[PDB]
Amino acid sequence: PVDVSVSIFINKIYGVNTLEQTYKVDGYIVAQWTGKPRKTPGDKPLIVENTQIERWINNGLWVPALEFINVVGSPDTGNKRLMLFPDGRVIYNARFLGSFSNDMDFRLFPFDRQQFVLELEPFSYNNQQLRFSDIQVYTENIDNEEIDEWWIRGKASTHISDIRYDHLSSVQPNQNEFSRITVRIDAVRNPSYYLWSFILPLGLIIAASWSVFWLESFSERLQTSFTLMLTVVAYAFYTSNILGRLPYTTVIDQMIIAGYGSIFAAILLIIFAHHRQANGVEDDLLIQRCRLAFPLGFLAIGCVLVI
Amino acid sequence: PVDVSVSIFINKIYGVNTLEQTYKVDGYIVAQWTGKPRKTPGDKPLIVENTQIERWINNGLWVPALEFINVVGSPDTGNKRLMLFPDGRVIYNARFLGSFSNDMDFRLFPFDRQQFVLELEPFSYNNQQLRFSDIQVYTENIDNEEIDEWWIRGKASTHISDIRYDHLSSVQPNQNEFSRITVRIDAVRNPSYYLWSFILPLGLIIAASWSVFWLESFSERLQTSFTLMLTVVAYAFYTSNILGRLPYTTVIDQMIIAGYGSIFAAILLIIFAHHRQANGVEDDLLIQRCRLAFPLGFLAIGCVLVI
Amino acid sequence: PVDVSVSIFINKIYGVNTLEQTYKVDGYIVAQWTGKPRKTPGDKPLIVENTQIERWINNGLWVPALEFINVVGSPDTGNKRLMLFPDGRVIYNARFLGSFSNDMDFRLFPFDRQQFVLELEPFSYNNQQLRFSDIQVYTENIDNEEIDEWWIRGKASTHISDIRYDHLSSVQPNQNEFSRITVRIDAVRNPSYYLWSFILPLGLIIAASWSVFWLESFSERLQTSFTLMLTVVAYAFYTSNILGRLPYTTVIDQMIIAGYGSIFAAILLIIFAHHRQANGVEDDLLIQRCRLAFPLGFLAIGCVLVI
Amino acid sequence: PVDVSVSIFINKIYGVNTLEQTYKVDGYIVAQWTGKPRKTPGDKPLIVENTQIERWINNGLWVPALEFINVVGSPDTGNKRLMLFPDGRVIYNARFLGSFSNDMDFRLFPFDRQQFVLELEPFSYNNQQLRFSDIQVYTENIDNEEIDEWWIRGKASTHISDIRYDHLSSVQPNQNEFSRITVRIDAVRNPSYYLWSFILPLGLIIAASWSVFWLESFSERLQTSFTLMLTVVAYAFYTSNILGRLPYTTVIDQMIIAGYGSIFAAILLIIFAHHRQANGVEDDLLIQRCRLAFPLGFLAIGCVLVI
Amino acid sequence: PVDVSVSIFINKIYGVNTLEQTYKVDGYIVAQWTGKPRKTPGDKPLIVENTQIERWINNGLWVPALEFINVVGSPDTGNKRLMLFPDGRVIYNARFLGSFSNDMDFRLFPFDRQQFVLELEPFSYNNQQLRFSDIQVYTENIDNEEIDEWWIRGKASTHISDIRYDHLSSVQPNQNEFSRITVRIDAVRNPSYYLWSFILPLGLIIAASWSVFWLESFSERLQTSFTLMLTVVAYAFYTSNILGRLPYTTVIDQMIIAGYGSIFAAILLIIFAHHRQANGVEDDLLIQRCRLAFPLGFLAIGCVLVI
């Protein structure tokens, strides 16, 4: 079994696609193994780049194809090199930008955490083994984080493993295990923006919706609530047009629904206080009670959301 | 006729385009047939990848071109391999990401069901037969379903068939039948998001619009209804800007129209009760009747929507 | 002059770009002519695909370049084959997806009609003639039409002609005429969606805008009209954000302008009735007259729109 | 110096990008020069297309590379031919679609005028001269203009000139001047759509905003003005979501700002009339004066906008 | 060590991607070094373009690969030439369009400043040195600046340095330092558009929001504030749909938050004055005091924002 050691340099992780559960990775990938010794110009290692790389393969050079398992579409490979050492070593180095998929959960949206993963396997060889995997996620850890959108919690974890494929031919007795490198990078989203520009104004709106009870007339209380209803819809839209459409409701989307509920419950209470008492009494003990109880019931129900 | 057996591995189905009736499919495709025996290095099967694959075809190797019938534009083929066995077997393995089209019906939008299909035929050969089709849709079936946007009901169905092309040349007496593999995967949309963030708020709005009759004055009743009218339009827009523009009205689009109708019918009733009775009587038996009857008539018409 | 007969199979026409006046066409293109007889393996016609096609051209095989005149950018050609017959026939078959342009008029938007055209010419040869053009637009004609966005009125019409290019070199005495195939497919847009989700609610809004006269006070009439004005703007936006921005006003855009006019004319009449009569008389004979005349004047002006 | 004559056929100019100051040009490009005489099949001119063009360059044929100076990214070249004449003439013909940049000013937005320019230079040769430039902008000039988005005022102007590059090597004594063809096509935007769907409704709204003074109470006048304030914001948005974001304010963008100013100035006057006079007099001579003067001051300031 | 001198011509910098922190650069890149002397046709320098460049590399010509370190994906290379001098000089000239990344701060949005950087390194050689870097940012400096979106303060700065890579093989004793060219261009955003179309109208709205205190009744004061609240939401959306979603709050985003606060603070004060005084006194000394103090407190807090 050929011993192949890879090294992965990560420059930039960006472009998270929430609907497709994908993200972009730009960086370099190096792989090194030892083969037959070779006659090289002089005795220095030979450097072969780009189009000339295919030429050595035509003359018989073995360069195994390594596939990104979780890549979504063929990645963009920039420059690529072959390092031919006289003692048999071979080092392949290539710059790449690719889009990768992983199971990503966004239910706890502004405060969510994710891990960007890479999965690397040889495309056709099981009789060749990934020897050791060193990844260098050299991006700032303490420089610009409150400024950046994602916070990388710690240096990446590596794990080389063996994957068992069952459905093969009928001629393979036992060589159906492939070497797989699995890289994991944990990251947490920066909630700062969504707090100030989304959650807070919605709170102010939802809070101000409770001040509908401080109106004196019943007509004032019911009519105004319809203008409040419109405000939530308009704010529900402002949110959606910028955030997007996930398959599941988010925290902000739950707050949006809560705004709808608070206002509709106020409409019911406002109508209730009018026609609840016999002979046209306006039940002022309710309008004044829920004048502060309606804010409190919303805070009490909100704490069970974190159950 | 050459016996060709294919295997299709499906990694990911995503990116449904409702207007174009298309969807993205990432996976692998394997095809195996038996040809002339061959001298191989030693006696082990030879592996040929990527650029070297074309070289064997230049020297005379027969590799038939298989086309995805329902593909929309050339698919992205990642790595591809040739497995050359000494006893004559040939295994072609290729990673692909492609967009496929199918007749897709979206009238019952949030609750619609679809099937993603793949259609594979030899491009030029009818004297070559697809022998058996095994597809492995190994994606979760009981892991993350309430979390994902689509729910795969069951394992995919396969069907090898014969397609008759009429309009050919004039030299083909009887060889105008091509082997076609047709794969079908059934899936149902996860309605969770559209229920909570779209259908529910619209219900709350449509319901609250009926509380206009609980206003005491006629001026109050008619003026407020115009604010309700604006609210539906604003909600119609919140919906449309996020969902899109389908060629046919959806379930949600019908509810929006129902909202418009309920409000416009309320405007008619509110004006009617005012000027229906002689000498300016306000017909209070109407405003109080439809105070609860207007909610009931909407529920009665909604049940005939499912007729 | 070489006799070349072409066949065009049309699988799918989609993605109309209203601003760029373009549309997408997926299908196949076949071309057949008779050349020198040839020695083939055995005596059966030889099949040459994809990369192997260029090789025969290197060894001298004449394969003319046919250009889509109205194509917008190089189209995406999938698989391509050459059928080499021993008696001299040559059949070129290629799958393609391309974007084509034509003069498209959208002034009668929801009810507009269009024709999708294809124009095919030899790129460099005038001494070679397109012999006959058979196109197979085998898409449903009576299956799913009320469901699809476009309705194909009938099977495609074809027209082979000769195009005279003037500005050529100085050495061409008379060979400046090229053979051109022109395929035309007429289609009418399905107005269902735009009627129910756009035209109807606008009518309801415009109609309800006339109910401003059923208010009793002048203050009510003028103040409410400002909320109606806002409602049209909000609806004008809902329309535009989903449809788009054409270079010319559409039917829907004219109705929107009619909404602006109806409301603005109501403001004038509402203000007129107040200060028209001497000593502050409110001219109640006007508010009651245009209470129904304003709906009628809009219906009368709408009929002259179809003049 | 080699004498090269070019001809540029322009089929379609579309896709203006206001922010990037670019536009799309589809057409053909022809170049002709006279070189060494040549032995050709028979004695007829030889036609070489697409992949075969590169082959003649390998055997030594001189085909100069012509670059579009103001192109943004490599253009999409469709079919290309070589016409090899026996007397030494060589004609290169290629279809192309490319994006070109020019300084484009949009300050007078609906009524702006632009010129789409093409700049063509040899990439590496200064000892080779562009002999004459004929461009054929055969697009309708009197057919569909009120229907199309841009109006071409007249046939294009051509200009071959000499460009002096300074910063070269140290070995070039006098050969640092390159031949440049400069084609200019003047075009004016079709304002019809923006007048009817943008400028006119804004005028109606801005006009109707002045009718706030026809309200009798002070409370009516100030409260309504806030609804007018909201209406302008909604209309400012309807405009922007369809037009876009230019680096400078447009004519329409100025009208929007004028709407904001008129309403805010109205708020000031409405509040002014209330508390300007001692002992609570409402200064009715102001409300009735600016009832018509406020429309007049807006027209007077609007005329100085064209100073 | 080989002496390589580069020259970079920058034609156009556009397409700032605020979320991805990237920008597009179109221009040329030239590199010159001296190698072995060579026999050339006649004795003039030989010009090799495009496809022919690869051919000399096959026969042994050394052309090092230079990588853009901060490029995001492989850039679009237009025409490229090789200048082969007989005395050993070699000049490589290539047109390119690429997207580059740099750390970009947008916190002070309309008034922010940025620098567009290029980073150029040899891909595989450390025993080869970038000799001198001349970049020609010949774009207007005093022509169109108030018209363009960005203002380039001055000509670009250059910086050749040495980059030390640690994690290399085990056979490199001391050759782990690579030459890096770093070009920097400073630019300031044109705030004109954002001042007139965003900052000014928001100021008027926030200012006009303070005129709610000039209403006489308490019912008037609270009801109108809900219409003001909606106005901020509508304007918050107008802003966002055109600007986008940055990871951090901007100056404009802060003003939006200030608008919500002023209105929400107004709601509290309006309700306070009603129920603050015993026996139902309306505390008119408060409504008139903050009639001007509320504008002043907003101006007083706004100056501490620039702290």
PDB file of N, CA, C and O in Angstrom, chain A residues 20-21 58 65 67 69 71-74 123-124 169 171 219 223 226 237 240-241 245-248 257 274, chain B residues 12 14 28 47 49 52 55 76 78-79 81 89 95 147-149 192-194 211 216 220 224 237-238 241:
ATOM      1  N   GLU A  20     -29.191  25.267   0.226  1.00  0.00           N
ATOM      2  CA  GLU A  20     -28.492  24.118  -0.328  1.00  0.00           C
ATOM      3  C   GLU A  20     -27.541  23.468   0.669  1.00  0.00           C
ATOM      4  O   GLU A  20     -26.984  22.407   0.366  1.00  0.00           O
ATOM      5  N   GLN A  21     -27.354  24.077   1.841  1.00  0.00           N
ATOM      6  CA  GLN A  21     -26.455  23.573   2.878  1.00  0.00           C
ATOM      7  C   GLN A  21     -25.039  23.391   2.330  1.00  0.00           C
ATOM      8  O   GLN A  21     -24.444  22.313   2.402  1.00  0.00           O
ATOM      9  N   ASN A  58       1.388  10.964 -19.371  1.00  0.00           N
ATOM     10  CA  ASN A  58       1.376  10.272 -20.657  1.00  0.00           C
ATOM     11  C   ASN A  58       2.556   9.320 -20.775  1.00  0.00           C
ATOM     12  O   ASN A  58       2.421   8.208 -21.297  1.00  0.00           O
ATOM     13  N   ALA A  65      -5.843  10.215  -8.512  1.00  0.00           N
ATOM     14  CA  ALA A  65      -6.912  11.199  -8.432  1.00  0.00           C
ATOM     15  C   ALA A  65      -7.554  11.125  -7.053  1.00  0.00           C
ATOM     16  O   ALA A  65      -8.057  10.070  -6.653  1.00  0.00           O
ATOM     17  N   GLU A  67     -10.560  12.681  -4.736  1.00  0.00           N
ATOM     18  CA  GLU A  67     -11.843  13.357  -4.882  1.00  0.00           C
ATOM     19  C   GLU A  67     -12.325  13.909  -3.547  1.00  0.00           C
ATOM     20  O   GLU A  67     -12.212  13.247  -2.510  1.00  0.00           O
ATOM     21  N   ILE A  69     -15.292  14.202  -1.455  1.00  0.00           N
ATOM     22  CA  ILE A  69     -16.552  13.464  -1.428  1.00  0.00           C
ATOM     23  C   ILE A  69     -17.727  14.425  -1.328  1.00  0.00           C
ATOM     24  O   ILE A  69     -18.710  14.316  -2.070  1.00  0.00           O
ATOM     25  N   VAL A  71     -17.917  17.564  -2.111  1.00  0.00           N
ATOM     26  CA  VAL A  71     -17.917  18.704  -3.021  1.00  0.00           C
ATOM     27  C   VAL A  71     -19.204  18.691  -3.833  1.00  0.00           C
ATOM     28  O   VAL A  71     -19.761  17.632  -4.146  1.00  0.00           O
ATOM     29  N   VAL A  72     -19.701  19.878  -4.157  1.00  0.00           N
ATOM     30  CA  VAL A  72     -20.899  20.043  -4.969  1.00  0.00           C
ATOM     31  C   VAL A  72     -20.458  20.658  -6.290  1.00  0.00           C
ATOM     32  O   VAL A  72     -20.364  21.882  -6.415  1.00  0.00           O
ATOM     33  N   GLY A  73     -20.219  19.814  -7.283  1.00  0.00           N
ATOM     34  CA  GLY A  73     -19.689  20.260  -8.563  1.00  0.00           C
ATOM     35  C   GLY A  73     -18.175  20.341  -8.570  1.00  0.00           C
ATOM     36  O   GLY A  73     -17.522  20.525  -7.544  1.00  0.00           O
ATOM     37  N   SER A  74     -17.608  20.190  -9.766  1.00  0.00           N
ATOM     38  CA  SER A  74     -16.159  20.147  -9.919  1.00  0.00           C
ATOM     39  C   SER A  74     -15.536  21.442  -9.407  1.00  0.00           C
ATOM     40  O   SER A  74     -15.977  22.533  -9.794  1.00  0.00           O
ATOM     41  N   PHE A 123      -9.931   8.360  -5.508  1.00  0.00           N
ATOM     42  CA  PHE A 123     -11.086   8.114  -6.366  1.00  0.00           C
ATOM     43  C   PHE A 123     -11.190   6.645  -6.758  1.00  0.00           C
ATOM     44  O   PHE A 123     -12.293   6.082  -6.784  1.00  0.00           O
ATOM     45  N   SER A 124     -10.061   6.001  -7.063  1.00  0.00           N
ATOM     46  CA  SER A 124     -10.078   4.653  -7.611  1.00  0.00           C
ATOM     47  C   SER A 124      -9.269   3.626  -6.829  1.00  0.00           C
ATOM     48  O   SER A 124      -9.398   2.429  -7.112  1.00  0.00           O
ATOM     49  N   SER A 169     -18.343  -5.036  -7.386  1.00  0.00           N
ATOM     50  CA  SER A 169     -18.510  -6.048  -8.420  1.00  0.00           C
ATOM     51  C   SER A 169     -18.808  -7.405  -7.792  1.00  0.00           C
ATOM     52  O   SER A 169     -19.475  -7.484  -6.755  1.00  0.00           O
ATOM     53  N   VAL A 171     -15.916  -9.653  -8.073  1.00  0.00           N
ATOM     54  CA  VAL A 171     -14.558 -10.176  -8.126  1.00  0.00           C
ATOM     55  C   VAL A 171     -13.696  -9.675  -6.968  1.00  0.00           C
ATOM     56  O   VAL A 171     -12.604 -10.223  -6.742  1.00  0.00           O
ATOM     57  N   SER A 219     -63.191  52.392  20.429  1.00  0.00           N
ATOM     58  CA  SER A 219     -62.915  52.601  19.011  1.00  0.00           C
ATOM     59  C   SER A 219     -61.433  52.852  18.763  1.00  0.00           C
ATOM     60  O   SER A 219     -60.855  52.319  17.808  1.00  0.00           O
ATOM     61  N   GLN A 223     -59.373  50.158  16.418  1.00  0.00           N
ATOM     62  CA  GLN A 223     -58.890  50.710  15.153  1.00  0.00           C
ATOM     63  C   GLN A 223     -57.368  50.727  15.098  1.00  0.00           C
ATOM     64  O   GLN A 223     -56.764  50.317  14.101  1.00  0.00           O
ATOM     65  N   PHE A 226     -55.406  47.536  14.238  1.00  0.00           N
ATOM     66  CA  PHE A 226     -55.296  47.176  12.828  1.00  0.00           C
ATOM     67  C   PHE A 226     -54.085  47.836  12.183  1.00  0.00           C
ATOM     68  O   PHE A 226     -53.445  47.248  11.304  1.00  0.00           O
ATOM     69  N   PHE A 237     -41.989  41.330   6.448  1.00  0.00           N
ATOM     70  CA  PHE A 237     -41.469  41.329   5.090  1.00  0.00           C
ATOM     71  C   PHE A 237     -40.043  41.865   5.032  1.00  0.00           C
ATOM     72  O   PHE A 237     -39.177  41.269   4.383  1.00  0.00           O
ATOM     73  N   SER A 240     -37.898  39.087   5.960  1.00  0.00           N
ATOM     74  CA  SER A 240     -37.821  37.990   4.998  1.00  0.00           C
ATOM     75  C   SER A 240     -37.023  38.373   3.756  1.00  0.00           C
ATOM     76  O   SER A 240     -36.231  37.570   3.250  1.00  0.00           O
ATOM     77  N   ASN A 241     -37.220  39.592   3.247  1.00  0.00           N
ATOM     78  CA  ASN A 241     -36.558  40.004   2.013  1.00  0.00           C
ATOM     79  C   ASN A 241     -35.042  40.038   2.134  1.00  0.00           C
ATOM     80  O   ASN A 241     -34.347  39.921   1.118  1.00  0.00           O
ATOM     81  N   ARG A 245     -35.552  32.356   2.850  1.00  0.00           N
ATOM     82  CA  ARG A 245     -36.591  31.349   3.084  1.00  0.00           C
ATOM     83  C   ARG A 245     -35.923  30.020   3.422  1.00  0.00           C
ATOM     84  O   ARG A 245     -35.502  29.283   2.527  1.00  0.00           O
ATOM     85  N   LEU A 246     -35.814  29.724   4.707  1.00  0.00           N
ATOM     86  CA  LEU A 246     -35.313  28.431   5.139  1.00  0.00           C
ATOM     87  C   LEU A 246     -36.444  27.408   5.174  1.00  0.00           C
ATOM     88  O   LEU A 246     -37.622  27.772   5.194  1.00  0.00           O
ATOM     89  N   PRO A 247     -36.116  26.110   5.164  1.00  0.00           N
ATOM     90  CA  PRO A 247     -37.167  25.084   5.262  1.00  0.00           C
ATOM     91  C   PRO A 247     -37.850  25.040   6.617  1.00  0.00           C
ATOM     92  O   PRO A 247     -38.893  24.385   6.743  1.00  0.00           O
ATOM     93  N   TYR A 248     -37.287  25.691   7.630  1.00  0.00           N
ATOM     94  CA  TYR A 248     -37.826  25.678   8.979  1.00  0.00           C
ATOM     95  C   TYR A 248     -37.836  27.091   9.542  1.00  0.00           C
ATOM     96  O   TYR A 248     -37.041  27.945   9.142  1.00  0.00           O
ATOM     97  N   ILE A 257     -43.942  35.531  14.394  1.00  0.00           N
ATOM     98  CA  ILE A 257     -45.225  34.896  14.682  1.00  0.00           C
ATOM     99  C   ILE A 257     -45.756  35.357  16.033  1.00  0.00           C
ATOM    100  O   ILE A 257     -46.963  35.578  16.201  1.00  0.00           O
ATOM    101  N   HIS A 274     -65.158  45.050  25.738  1.00  0.00           N
ATOM    102  CA  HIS A 274     -66.321  45.844  25.357  1.00  0.00           C
ATOM    103  C   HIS A 274     -67.626  45.115  25.674  1.00  0.00           C
ATOM    104  O   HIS A 274     -68.487  45.639  26.390  1.00  0.00           O
TER     105      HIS A 274
ATOM    106  N   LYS B  12     -27.397  13.721  -3.506  1.00  0.00           N
ATOM    107  CA  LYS B  12     -28.029  14.974  -3.115  1.00  0.00           C
ATOM    108  C   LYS B  12     -29.003  15.402  -4.204  1.00  0.00           C
ATOM    109  O   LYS B  12     -28.638  15.439  -5.384  1.00  0.00           O
ATOM    110  N   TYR B  14     -31.429  18.717  -4.821  1.00  0.00           N
ATOM    111  CA  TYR B  14     -31.632  20.057  -4.294  1.00  0.00           C
ATOM    112  C   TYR B  14     -31.916  21.009  -5.449  1.00  0.00           C
ATOM    113  O   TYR B  14     -31.971  20.609  -6.615  1.00  0.00           O
ATOM    114  N   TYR B  28     -22.898   9.714  -8.582  1.00  0.00           N
ATOM    115  CA  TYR B  28     -22.004   8.952  -9.436  1.00  0.00           C
ATOM    116  C   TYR B  28     -22.822   8.108 -10.400  1.00  0.00           C
ATOM    117  O   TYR B  28     -24.008   7.843 -10.180  1.00  0.00           O
ATOM    118  N   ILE B  47      -6.465   0.652 -13.988  1.00  0.00           N
ATOM    119  CA  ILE B  47      -7.255   1.834 -13.664  1.00  0.00           C
ATOM    120  C   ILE B  47      -6.786   2.987 -14.541  1.00  0.00           C
ATOM    121  O   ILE B  47      -5.596   3.325 -14.553  1.00  0.00           O
ATOM    122  N   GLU B  49      -7.804   7.036 -15.562  1.00  0.00           N
ATOM    123  CA  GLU B  49      -8.567   8.171 -15.055  1.00  0.00           C
ATOM    124  C   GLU B  49      -8.405   9.396 -15.944  1.00  0.00           C
ATOM    125  O   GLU B  49      -7.331   9.635 -16.505  1.00  0.00           O
ATOM    126  N   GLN B  52      -6.310  10.377 -19.326  1.00  0.00           N
ATOM    127  CA  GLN B  52      -5.862   9.125 -19.918  1.00  0.00           C
ATOM    128  C   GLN B  52      -7.014   8.303 -20.485  1.00  0.00           C
ATOM    129  O   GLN B  52      -6.769   7.394 -21.284  1.00  0.00           O
ATOM    130  N   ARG B  55      -7.241   8.650 -24.186  1.00  0.00           N
ATOM    131  CA  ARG B  55      -6.136   8.035 -24.915  1.00  0.00           C
ATOM    132  C   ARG B  55      -6.478   6.615 -25.348  1.00  0.00           C
ATOM    133  O   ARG B  55      -6.149   6.207 -26.469  1.00  0.00           O
ATOM    134  N   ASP B  76     -22.097  18.508 -15.143  1.00  0.00           N
ATOM    135  CA  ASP B  76     -20.721  18.663 -14.686  1.00  0.00           C
ATOM    136  C   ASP B  76     -20.189  17.305 -14.247  1.00  0.00           C
ATOM    137  O   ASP B  76     -20.596  16.777 -13.207  1.00  0.00           O
ATOM    138  N   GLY B  78     -17.270  15.272 -12.707  1.00  0.00           N
ATOM    139  CA  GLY B  78     -16.063  15.419 -11.925  1.00  0.00           C
ATOM    140  C   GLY B  78     -15.030  14.410 -12.366  1.00  0.00           C
ATOM    141  O   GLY B  78     -14.701  14.329 -13.553  1.00  0.00           O
ATOM    142  N   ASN B  79     -14.508  13.634 -11.422  1.00  0.00           N
ATOM    143  CA  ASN B  79     -13.586  12.571 -11.784  1.00  0.00           C
ATOM    144  C   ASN B  79     -14.331  11.449 -12.491  1.00  0.00           C
ATOM    145  O   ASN B  79     -15.491  11.155 -12.189  1.00  0.00           O
ATOM    146  N   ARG B  81     -13.420   7.341 -14.180  1.00  0.00           N
ATOM    147  CA  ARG B  81     -12.445   6.266 -14.233  1.00  0.00           C
ATOM    148  C   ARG B  81     -12.877   5.226 -15.253  1.00  0.00           C
ATOM    149  O   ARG B  81     -14.057   5.106 -15.598  1.00  0.00           O
ATOM    150  N   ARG B  89     -14.159  -7.633 -18.904  1.00  0.00           N
ATOM    151  CA  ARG B  89     -15.062  -6.706 -18.232  1.00  0.00           C
ATOM    152  C   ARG B  89     -14.532  -5.278 -18.313  1.00  0.00           C
ATOM    153  O   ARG B  89     -13.321  -5.037 -18.306  1.00  0.00           O
ATOM    154  N   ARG B  95     -18.294  10.739 -11.487  1.00  0.00           N
ATOM    155  CA  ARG B  95     -19.020  11.651 -10.615  1.00  0.00           C
ATOM    156  C   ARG B  95     -19.655  12.747 -11.455  1.00  0.00           C
ATOM    157  O   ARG B  95     -19.049  13.244 -12.408  1.00  0.00           O
ATOM    158  N   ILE B 147     -36.644  18.142   9.483  1.00  0.00           N
ATOM    159  CA  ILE B 147     -35.665  19.213   9.353  1.00  0.00           C
ATOM    160  C   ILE B 147     -35.383  19.562   7.892  1.00  0.00           C
ATOM    161  O   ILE B 147     -35.115  20.725   7.578  1.00  0.00           O
ATOM    162  N   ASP B 148     -35.457  18.597   6.981  1.00  0.00           N
ATOM    163  CA  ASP B 148     -35.133  18.872   5.589  1.00  0.00           C
ATOM    164  C   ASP B 148     -36.360  19.377   4.836  1.00  0.00           C
ATOM    165  O   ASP B 148     -37.503  19.212   5.271  1.00  0.00           O
ATOM    166  N   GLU B 149     -36.102  19.999   3.682  1.00  0.00           N
ATOM    167  CA  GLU B 149     -37.179  20.621   2.917  1.00  0.00           C
ATOM    168  C   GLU B 149     -38.043  19.592   2.201  1.00  0.00           C
ATOM    169  O   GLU B 149     -39.247  19.811   2.022  1.00  0.00           O
ATOM    170  N   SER B 192     -43.879  22.586   6.966  1.00  0.00           N
ATOM    171  CA  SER B 192     -43.759  23.220   8.276  1.00  0.00           C
ATOM    172  C   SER B 192     -43.549  24.725   8.158  1.00  0.00           C
ATOM    173  O   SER B 192     -44.291  25.514   8.753  1.00  0.00           O
ATOM    174  N   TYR B 193     -42.554  25.143   7.368  1.00  0.00           N
ATOM    175  CA  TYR B 193     -42.238  26.567   7.261  1.00  0.00           C
ATOM    176  C   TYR B 193     -43.419  27.371   6.733  1.00  0.00           C
ATOM    177  O   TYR B 193     -43.774  28.415   7.294  1.00  0.00           O
ATOM    178  N   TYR B 194     -44.029  26.914   5.639  1.00  0.00           N
ATOM    179  CA  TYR B 194     -45.086  27.696   5.008  1.00  0.00           C
ATOM    180  C   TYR B 194     -46.328  27.776   5.887  1.00  0.00           C
ATOM    181  O   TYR B 194     -47.082  28.750   5.803  1.00  0.00           O
ATOM    182  N   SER B 211     -63.420  41.229  12.505  1.00  0.00           N
ATOM    183  CA  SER B 211     -63.723  42.028  13.683  1.00  0.00           C
ATOM    184  C   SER B 211     -64.077  43.470  13.345  1.00  0.00           C
ATOM    185  O   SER B 211     -64.320  44.259  14.266  1.00  0.00           O
ATOM    186  N   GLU B 216     -68.677  50.307  16.296  1.00  0.00           N
ATOM    187  CA  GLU B 216     -70.023  50.794  16.570  1.00  0.00           C
ATOM    188  C   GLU B 216     -70.549  51.700  15.459  1.00  0.00           C
ATOM    189  O   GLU B 216     -71.680  51.522  14.994  1.00  0.00           O
ATOM    190  N   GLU B 220     -66.584  54.275  11.296  1.00  0.00           N
ATOM    191  CA  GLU B 220     -65.531  53.407  11.812  1.00  0.00           C
ATOM    192  C   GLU B 220     -65.433  52.122  10.999  1.00  0.00           C
ATOM    193  O   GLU B 220     -64.332  51.682  10.647  1.00  0.00           O
ATOM    194  N   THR B 224     -61.962  51.734   8.527  1.00  0.00           N
ATOM    195  CA  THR B 224     -61.008  50.717   8.958  1.00  0.00           C
ATOM    196  C   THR B 224     -60.823  49.640   7.895  1.00  0.00           C
ATOM    197  O   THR B 224     -59.709  49.139   7.695  1.00  0.00           O
ATOM    198  N   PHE B 237     -47.783  40.838  -0.882  1.00  0.00           N
ATOM    199  CA  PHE B 237     -46.448  41.148  -1.378  1.00  0.00           C
ATOM    200  C   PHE B 237     -45.371  40.408  -0.593  1.00  0.00           C
ATOM    201  O   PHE B 237     -44.442  39.844  -1.184  1.00  0.00           O
ATOM    202  N   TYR B 238     -45.452  40.444   0.738  1.00  0.00           N
ATOM    203  CA  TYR B 238     -44.578  39.630   1.578  1.00  0.00           C
ATOM    204  C   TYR B 238     -44.501  38.195   1.067  1.00  0.00           C
ATOM    205  O   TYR B 238     -43.414  37.625   0.923  1.00  0.00           O
ATOM    206  N   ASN B 241     -42.858  38.134  -2.903  1.00  0.00           N
ATOM    207  CA  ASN B 241     -41.436  38.438  -3.032  1.00  0.00           C
ATOM    208  C   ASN B 241     -40.551  37.306  -2.532  1.00  0.00           C
ATOM    209  O   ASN B 241     -39.393  37.204  -2.952  1.00  0.00           O
TER     210      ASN B 241
END
